Amino acid sequence: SFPEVVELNVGGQVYFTRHSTLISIPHSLLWKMFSLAKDSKGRFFIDRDGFLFRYILDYLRDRQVVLPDHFPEKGRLKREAEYFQLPDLVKLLTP
Amino acid sequence: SFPEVVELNVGGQVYFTRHSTLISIPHSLLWKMFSDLAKDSKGRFFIDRDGFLFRYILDYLRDRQVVLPDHFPEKGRLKREAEYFQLPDLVKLLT
Amino acid sequence: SFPEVVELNVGGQVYFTRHSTLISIPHSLLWKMFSPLAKDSKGRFFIDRDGFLFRYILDYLRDRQVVLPDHFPEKGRLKREAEYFQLPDLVKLLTP
Amino acid sequence: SFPEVVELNVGGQVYFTRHSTLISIPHSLLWKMFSPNDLAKDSKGRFFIDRDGFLFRYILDYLRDRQVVLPDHFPEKGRLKREAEYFQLPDLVKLLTP
Amino acid sequence: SFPEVVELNVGGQVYFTRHSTLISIPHSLLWKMFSDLAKDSKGRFFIDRDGFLFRYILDYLRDRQVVLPDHFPEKGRLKREAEYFQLPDLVKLLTP
């Protein structure tokens, strides 16, 4: 069984989230993953960009994502959204 | 009963605050929460939200006002956090 | 043997990746480095190259394509890094 | 003796490099500094270099490849030439003069 | 006693320099300061001045000359910083 609070390591960046948040969107990558690669400290490892994952996590939490003003990695985040299989997030970052 | 000093884990970022600070604003989310709670591996109360932005949420709870750093790019993201924690006066302060 | 999750130090910048990602492209520098070694004070594997540009090298090793930030000024510097790590397909993507 | 991987602090900016990279160019300043007691160290034990930390990445890149590619519309070309002069890298000074 | 390497905080911007560099010019403000000092929360010596312009003040203390970025505009603002730190030779260099 998975714990209520899941400790993650996304390409070096440590993130904490509820197990419910990870499996919130069915047929997505994280849902497939948590419905495993582990680091030296036992944290679940995701081989992706750690900085962009906070905007992925925010989308999983609210199903909408607010980005900082003058955000230069809109296209890079769209790629991350594609990887985690979040089509509604890809659709938000596309225009 | 809740201790005087409450140890928190907000999406990975550890925060320490007084119990009085959390229940300072009635009918807000944190007030409802601290007046059956998700806990991390180390027993810390877990809040599934952005850890960075929570310091500005805490600052507002301690002073009723919040001073932001120069050229702050996450004004809109903080307004979303204020909405979540149900702090209408903080949302209004972010016009 | 090499662990599943490899902790790296690229000229000061700490990166974490799967061992499979490093040896993903055969006859490349990282493949030569991690297939059968300099370590920092904390035991992390050391590569003496620019740490900032390595995130775009790592992204390419992950997806075989790399998306860059808007108005990216280090396209030429990244092409040099791609040459060093012996990633010809990445050089070909950056060069035109 | 110096370790294989050298931890540096250049005007508060931390850099990591091989010892071989520092002593790569003979009769240069870093070569004089790291060729075999008395070196300046920061509070965390890192070797301290009292120079601009931002420009040092382009100095380090030159020591690695003997060539340096700069970002597009780089405004500190003249300031980097000064840094190249300080570290006694004549071929780098020559590259930055036109 | 002052350490060999001095950690500074000039209006938010962190700078590291040798103690010798600070006291290099006698009868200047920094010389008077480093020959009961304001410190930030992390223990760094605090100077309530513009952090961005201080790198050009530090560079002058190091080389006893001024190398500025290409097309640098804020000369006048740097002259006022030079006046503050009591560096008359630097003021004399920035005048036209």
Q: Which domains does chain E have, with CATH numbers?
A: 1-96 (3.30.710.10)
What is the rounded distance in angstroms from the CA atom of residue D55 to the CA atom of residue E17? 15
What is the rounded distance in angstroms from the CA atom of residue A41 to the CA atom of residue C63? 26
B12 phi, psi to nearest 5 deg: 110, -30
Technique used by the depositors: X-ray
Q: Minimal Cα–Cα distance from C25 to chain D, Å?
A: 23
- Residues 6+ positions from D31 with CB-CB distance below 8 Å: D22, D23, D24, D25
CB contact burial A29-40 (16+ within 10 A = b; e otherwise): bbbeebeeeebe
Q: Are D77 and E70 in contact (CB under 8 A)?
A: yes
What is the rounded distance in angstroms from the CA atom of residue C83 to the CA atom of residue C93? 12
Set of chain C residues whose Cβ sits within 8 Å of the Cβ of D16: 9, 11-12, 40, 46, 48
Set of chain C residues whose Cβ sits within 8 Å of the Cβ of D73: 73
Q: Name subunits touching E (3+ CB pairs < 8 A).
A: D
Compute the Cα dihedral for B14, B17, B19, B25 and give only its sign. Answer: negative
- Say whether A95 sits in a helix, a strand or coil: coil
* Residue whose token pair is 């109360």: B45
Q: Are D46 and D40 in contact (CB under 8 A)?
A: no
For residue D68, the tally of other CB atoms under 10 A from its CB is 21
What is the rounded distance in angstroms from the CA atom of residue A87 to the CA atom of residue D86? 54
Set of chain B residues whose Cβ sits within 8 Å of the Cβ of A61: 48-49
What is the rounded distance in angstroms from the CA atom of residue E78 to the CA atom of residue E57? 8
* Residue whose token pair is 């994502």: A65
Q: What is the DSSP secondary structure assignment for residue A94, as one 8-state letter?
A: -
Q: Name subunits touching C (3+ CB pairs < 8 A).
A: A, D
**Closest residue to C69, CB basis, from A9, A37, A73:** A73
Q: Are B85 and B30 in contact (CB under 8 A)?
A: yes
Q: Are A48 and C14 in contact (CB under 8 A)?
A: no
Q: What is the DSSP secondary structure assignment for residue E14, as one 8-state letter?
A: E
What is the rounded distance in angstroms from the CA atom of residue A9 to the CA atom of residue A22? 14
Compute the Cα dihedral for C64, C7, A15, B79 and give only its sign. Answer: negative
This structure's resolution (angstroms)?
Answer: 2.8
Q: CA separation (Å) from D4 to C35, D17, D22, D34, D38? A: 22, 8, 11, 12, 19
Residue B46: which H helix or E strand, with range?
A: strand B45-47
Mark yes or no for CB contact D79/E63 under 8 Å.
no
For residue C1, the tally of other CB atoms under 10 A from its CB is 4
D and E in touch (3+ CB pairs within 8 angstroms): yes
For E73, the token pair is 């505009």
Q: Which amino acid is at E76?
A: G
Strand-pair partners of E46: E9
What is the rounded distance in angstroms from the CA atom of residue A77 to the CA atom of residue A80? 5
Mark yes or no for CB contact C7/A40 under 8 Å.
yes
Angle (nearest 5°) at CA C86 between C85 and C87: 95
Closest by Cα among C25, C24, C80 to C54: C80
For chain D, the first-to-last Cα distance in angstroms comes to 40
Order across the sheet with B45-47: list the strands.
B13-18, B5-10, B45-47
**Closest residue to C9, CB basis, from D16, D57, D73:** D16
For E43, the token pair is 């223990």
Orientation angle between helical segments D56-65 and D77-86, nearest 10 degrees: 60
What is the rounded distance in angstroms from the CA atom of residue E87 to the CA atom of residue E76? 14
Q: Number of helices (H) and strands (E) in chain B: give both, helices first.
A: 5, 3
Mutate to test the interface with E, among D79, D87, D97 (most CBs of E within 10 A): D79
* Residue whose token pair is 């302060």: B93
What is the rounded distance in angstroms from the CA atom of residue E29 to the CA atom of residue C23? 57
Mark yes or no for CB contact E17/D51 under 8 Å.
no
Set of chain B residues whose Cβ sits within 8 Å of the Cβ of A14: 12
Mark yes or no for CB contact D64/C77 under 8 Å.
no
B and D in touch (3+ CB pairs within 8 angstroms): no
Set of chain D residues whose Cβ sits within 8 Å of the Cβ of C7: none
What is the rounded distance in angstroms from the CA atom of residue A75 to the CA atom of residue A94? 8
Q: Which amino acid is at D39?
A: L
Q: Which amino acid is at C65?
A: Q
Compute the Cα dihedral for B8, B13, B18, B24 and give only its sign. Answer: negative
Burial of D27 (0-12, 13-18, 19+ CB in 10 A): exposed
What is the rounded distance in angstroms from the CA atom of residue C49 to the CA atom of residue C47? 6
